[PDB]
């Protein structure tokens, strides 16, 4: 086509979606990880995760307001990944890298799994 | 912070949100423009437009499944802007630039209004 493109549009959209999350505006699901609860937008979860994409395209699960993750999933690892989904920023540290990689493998977030594997290989 | 960043994350998120729109997955509103109907995600509309941000933060309008725009709004202008919201690409042409600018002013999409003003000033 003969379209023009606004370079910062995608980043600005994601920044506003994170502002809605922080104010709990139009969140439509709660993700339960052990005792911890995380509110989010189903569309953003699907856009970032192969696991959530599969869950919310399912004709029965698409209507659920609560999703319980596998008890092996660490709440801190999930929190770091949820923050990444809404910001593009990953808080990867020596003390959390194993829990982050395991959570990213479960959530099917291929690019996060790739950087965790590379950072582990370096050490 | 000491975060790392994935450059393509925001663009990849927007690409997946557009894939959900094209398949009509988790769309939660219909925007009526004259006789024409457009399905979309409220969160994406809010993230891109000052008008939709105001509408869906309103305690009564946040629950509406149908929104009717002002009868002066041109359906083609709206369609071009809805496509921009989900792709960052604007199909700006000599034959549509006046309708696009007027629709962007109504929707409160400041960056689109700015490029339309500049393109009109050049001609």
């Amino acid at each position: 086509d003969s379209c023009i493109q606004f370079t910062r549009h995608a980043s600005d959209v994601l920044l506003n979606l994170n502002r809605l999350r922080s104010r709990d505006i139009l969140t439509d699901v709660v993700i339960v990880v052990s005792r911890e609860q995380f509110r989010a937008h189903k569309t953003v979860l699907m856009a970032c995760s192969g696991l959530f994409y599969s869950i919310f395209t399912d004709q029965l699960k698409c209507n659920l307001s609560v999703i319980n993750l596998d008890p092996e999933i660490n709440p801190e690892g999930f929190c770091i990944l949820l923050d990444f989904m809404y910001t593009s920023r990953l808080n990867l540290r020596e003390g959390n890298i194993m829990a982050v990689m395991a959570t990213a493998m479960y959530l099917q977030m291929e690019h996060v799994v790739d950087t965790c594997r590379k950072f582990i290989k370096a050490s | 912070d000491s975060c790392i960043q994935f450059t393509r994350h925001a663009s990849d998120v927007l690409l997946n949100l557009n894939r959900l729109r094209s398949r009509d997955i988790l769309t939660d509103v219909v925007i009526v423009v004259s006789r024409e109907q457009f399905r979309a995600h409220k969160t994406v509309l809010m993230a891109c437009s000052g008008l939709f941000y105001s509408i869906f933060t309103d305690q009564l309008k946040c629950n509406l499944s149908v929104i009717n725009l002002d009868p002066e709004i041109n359906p083609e202008g709206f369609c071009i802007l809805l496509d921009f919201m989900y792709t960052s690409r604007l199909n700006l042409r000599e034959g549509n630039i006046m309708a696009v600018m007027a629709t962007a002013m109504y929707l409160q999409m400041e960056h689109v209004v700015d490029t339309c003003r500049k393109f009109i000033k050049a001609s």
Binding site: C3, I4, Q5, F6 | R89, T115
Partner: peptide
């Protein structure tokens, strides 16, 4: 704005 750019030519993509």
């Amino acid at each position: 704005w750019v030519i993509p």
